């Protein structure tokens, strides 16, 4: 039921967050895989939402600690949840996770994590084949650019510019193709 999955994801979150703090890439990978499988097994949007929240918390912690591997693993799992859920809601939630992570990274001078997050935003837009996902991805890039400007993170401002240019140049093809 919903009570068993919530407690399960709670355990996963605890272990994954600790692993993200300590640079334990192997454990972060394993725990995020379990979050994905819990969402799979549950077959509800509620479970998808909770799993994406766990992924977000792990990736935010990782972003704060310069744990590039964990940010990468976590956002890949967000991407896969978006792929497998079969709903627009899951895609929008995954994009909000990516935005949250990229914003925290921008605030912490974590330019790897900004780069990883924006690349997943681009991939979500490329794979979704909806105009709305392209628009939302561009909004994510703008939010990250805004934060980077505010914090004096020139690397992140430049990365956001490059990803914006890529979406603007290439999204025309993504949508038709
Ligand atoms: Na679709």
Assigned token pair, 73: 């693993």
175 CA distance to ligand 1 middle (Å): 11
Residue 11's domain comprises 1-177
What's the CA-to-centroid distance between 141 and ligand 1, angstroms? Answer: 22
Q: State the Cα angle at 83 between 172 and 114, rounded to 5°.
A: 70
Q: Angle, nearest 10°, between helix axes 154-176 and 131-151?
A: 170
How far is the C-alpha of 159 from the C-alpha of 11, rounded, in Å? 35
Torsion of CA 25, 30, 36, 37, to 10 degrees: 180
d(CA 46, CA 66) in angstroms, rounded, equals 30
Is residue 56 a contact partner of residue 79, using CB atoms and an 8 Å limit? Answer: no
The long-range contacts involving 125-128, CB below 8 angstroms and separated by at least 24 positions, are: 125/167, 125/171, 125/174, 126/170, 126/171, 126/174, 127/83, 128/82, 128/91
Q: State in Å: Cα 21 to ligand 1 middle.
A: 35
Tokens of 22: 């300590």
**How many angstroms is it from 164 CA to the middle of ligand 1?**
22
* Structure tokens belonging to residue 92: 């929008």
**151 C-alpha to center of ligand 1: Å?**
36
Domain count of the fold of the chain: 1
Distances in Å between the alpha carbon of 69 and those of 6, 21, 25, 66, 113? 26, 12, 6, 9, 9
DSSP labels, the chain: -HHHHHHHHHHHHHHHHHHHHTT-HHHHHHHHHHHHHHHHHH-SHHHHHHHHHHHHHHHHHHHHTT-HHHHHHHHHHHHHHHHHH-SHHHHHHHHHHHHHHHHHHHHHT-HHHHHHHHHHHHHHHHHH--HHHHHHHHHHHHHHHHHHHHHT-HHHHHHHHHHHHHHHHHHHHHHH-
Q: What whole-number distance in Å separates Cα of residue 162 and Cα of residue 169?
A: 10
Who contacts 79 (Cβ-Cβ below 8 Å, separation ≥6)? 94, 120, 123, 124
CA of 140 from ligand 1 middle (Å) equals 20
Q: Which two tokens stand for residue 1?
A: 């039921």
Distance from Cα 86 to the centre of ligand 1, integer Å: 7
Closest to 60 measured CA to CA, from 30, 97, 109: 97
Resolution of the determined structure in angstroms stands at 1.5
Say which residues have a Cβ less than 8 Å from residue 43's Cβ, sequence separation at least 6.
Answer: none
Separation between Cα atoms, residue 106 and residue 151, nearest integer Å: 7
CA of 129 to the centre of ligand 1 (A): 7
Q: Using CA atoms, how far apart are residues 171 and 173, in angstroms rounded to an integer?
A: 5
CA–CA dist 78, 148 (Å, integer): 23
């Amino acid at each position: 039921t919903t009570e068993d999955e919530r407690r399960e994801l709670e355990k996963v979150a605890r272990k994954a967050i600790e692993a993200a703090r300590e640079g334990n890439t192997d454990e972060v990978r394993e725990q995020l895989q379990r979050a994905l499988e819990i969402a799979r097994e549950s077959g509800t949007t509620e479970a998808v939402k909770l799993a994406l929240e766990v992924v977000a918390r792990v990736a935010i912690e990782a972003a704060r600690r310069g744990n590039t591997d964990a940010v990468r693993e976590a956002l890949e799992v967000a991407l896969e949840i978006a792929r497998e859920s079969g709903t627009t809601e899951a895609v929008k939630l995954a994009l909000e996770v990516v935005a949250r992570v990229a914003i925290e990274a921008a605030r912490r001078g974590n330019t790897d994590a900004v780069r990883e997050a924006l690349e997943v935003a681009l991939e979500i837009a490329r794979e979704s084949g909806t105009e709305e996902a392209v628009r939302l991805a561009l909004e994510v890039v703008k939010r990250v650019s805004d934060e980077a400007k505010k914090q004096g993170n020139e690397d992140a401002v430049k990365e956001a510019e490059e990803v914006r240019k890529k979406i603007e140049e290439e999204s025309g093809g993504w949508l038709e193709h």
